[PDB]
């Protein structure tokens, strides 16, 4: 199916405390495989998956050399944005950056991403066509014009459309055992009693990969947008994911409600009903 | 692998 490689970068200024914090993390789909931490002792790009450890020394020296240049660039950008917005040197500010590429089942280029945020807000993003930018505000138009004159987008295309896909193919192959697997959700159900008449039903989906999933509550009948509790899909910590959906129902109609689980690993949607 | 091209805002 579809796959993706994304790198997430976070820079946080710390005036009066020291250099800005810098964190880089790289993902293939919902699996992290590398990190760089300015506050760590190694000061190198570090493996975070077993299938990336097989890379030779030249790979880690290169990623180290590149990611430290990223670190230096966001360090400069923090000061530039402070000027663009005429902010004081006292407060702490955050720069976030994400880029990468998607591929389809054929592992061919599908989409490319390259976008920034300042203090949690969109600042400038590369458009889907990979040739123009979206400036969130008047201040970001200064960056937009700068990057248009320097033909940044044209130069980025080779990486997003080409090199990014080449990397992703390599990783998918070297980590076939884990990256290309599919774990179907293990489903069960629980019954909780709100006082007297009303009760809650919870649908559980556990130990599934990838994290993509949908849980819907059927009454009679069909879905219930109202009175449906849906927690964010969370990581189990062992490479799989968890999620549950809950509905509030009067007692005695438990048999009327049914849970629908759709996951990539499931041959067909699962339907759960009380009790078990 | 990450970008080798660095540029400033």
């Amino acid at each position: 199916g579809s796959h993706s490689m994304r790198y997430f970068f976070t820079s946080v200024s710390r005036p009066g405390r020291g250099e800005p914090r810098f964190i880089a993390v790289g993902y293939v789909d919902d699996t992290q495989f590398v990190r760089f931490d300015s506050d760590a002792a190694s000061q190198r790009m570090e493996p975070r998956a077993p299938w990336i450890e097989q890379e030779g020394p030249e790979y880690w020296d290169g990623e180290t050399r590149k990611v430290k240049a990223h670190s230096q660039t966001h360090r400069v950008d923090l000061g530039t944005l402070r000027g663009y917005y005429n902010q004081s040197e006292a407060g702490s500010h955050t720069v976030q950056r994400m880029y990468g590429c998607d591929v389809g089942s054929d592992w061919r280029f599908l989409r490319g991403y390259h976008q920034y945020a300042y203090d949690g807000k969109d600042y400038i993003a590369l458009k889907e066509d990979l040739r123009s930018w979206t400036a969130a505000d008047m201040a970001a138009q200064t960056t937009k014009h700068k990057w248009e004159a320097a033909h940044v987008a044209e130069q980025l295309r080779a990486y997003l459309e080409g090199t990014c896909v080449e990397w992703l193919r390599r990783y998918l192959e070297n980590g076939k055992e884990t990256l290309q697997r599919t774990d179907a959700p293990k489903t069960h159900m629980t019954h909780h009693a709100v006082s007297d008449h009303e009760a809650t039903l919870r649908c559980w989906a556990l130990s599934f990969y990838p994290a993509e999933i949908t849980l819907t509550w059927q009454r009679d009948g069909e879905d219930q947008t109202q009175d449906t509790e849906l927690v964010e899909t969370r990581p189990a910590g062992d490479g799989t994911f968890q999620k549950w959906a809950a509905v509030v129902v009067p007692s005695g109609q438990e048999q009327r409600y049914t849970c629908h689980v759709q996951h990539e690993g499931l041959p067909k949607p699962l339907t759960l009903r009380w009790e078990a | 692998g990450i970008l080798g091209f660095v540029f400033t805002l």
Epitope: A150, E166 | G1, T8
Partner: T-cell receptor, first 116, second 111 residues
């Protein structure tokens, strides 16, 4: 490596001359350049080419023949003028995914003499 | 805007250190130093993609650079550089675009 096999070359004014350049690399995408350095020693960019893109241009006399499979990036000077007397350098560079962006690796160069 | 290199001509006594200046107001992030020798093309010495970032070329030994400011990228030819007689060219760019070279500098060793 970038190889320019002809250290010197001569052309008669108003005629045309072809400067050869061949390169070796494993990268799928990259950049190819031709630079002109007249007696002033000032480097002047003649043409840049990206492997992804297609041969394009030119409005001017200068032109290139880019053979991706053959790895040939020859520069063609037509209707040679006396001002074309200069040293012409072929150069290569990685794309944005490479570690040494944007370091240029230069050939040995070709001195072009224009006979009036 | 442009890039200004200096000095145009210059000589070094053996055992002497010397510095070449390079300034650019093109708002370019990257700056480079190249060395030109007859029978050879241009060979990269040093380059700085951004302030306080330094990447050595294959012939970096005997040379040193500093990038305290965006606009300046001075090159120092230390006495340790065994055979420094050559033509030195500063350069500036943003990636592979806007690539511009300076006027150039000629350095001679006067024993």
């Amino acid at each position: 490596t970038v190889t320019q096999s002809q250290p010197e070359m001569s052309v008669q004014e108003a005629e045309t001359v072809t400067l050869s350049c061949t390169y070796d690399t494993s990268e799928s995408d990259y950049y190819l350049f031709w630079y002109k350095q007249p007696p002033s020693r000032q480097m002047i960019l003649v043409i840049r080419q990206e492997a992804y893109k297609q041969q394009n241009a030119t409005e001017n006399r200068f032109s290139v023949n880019f053979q991706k499979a053959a790895k040939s990036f020859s520069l063609k000077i037509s209707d040679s003028q006396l001002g074309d007397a200069a040293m012409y350098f072929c150069a290569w560079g990685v794309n944005a995914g490479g570690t040494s962006y944007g370091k240029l690796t230069f050939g040995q160069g070709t001195i072009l003499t224009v006979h009036p | 805007g442009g890039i200004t290199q200096s000095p145009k001509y210059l000589f070094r006594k053996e055992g002497q250190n010397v510095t070449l200046s390079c300034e650019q107001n093109l708002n370019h992030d990257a700056m480079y130093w190249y060395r030109q020798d007859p029978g050879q093309g241009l060979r990269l010495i040093y380059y700085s993609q951004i302030v306080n970032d330094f990447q050595k070329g294959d012939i970096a030994e005997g040379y040193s650079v500093s990038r305290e400011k965006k606009e300046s990228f001075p090159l120092t030819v230390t006495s340790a550089q065994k055979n420094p007689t050559a033509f030195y060219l500063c350069a500036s760019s943003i990636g592979v675009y806007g690539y511009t070279f300076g006027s150039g500098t000629r350095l001679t060793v006067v024993e």
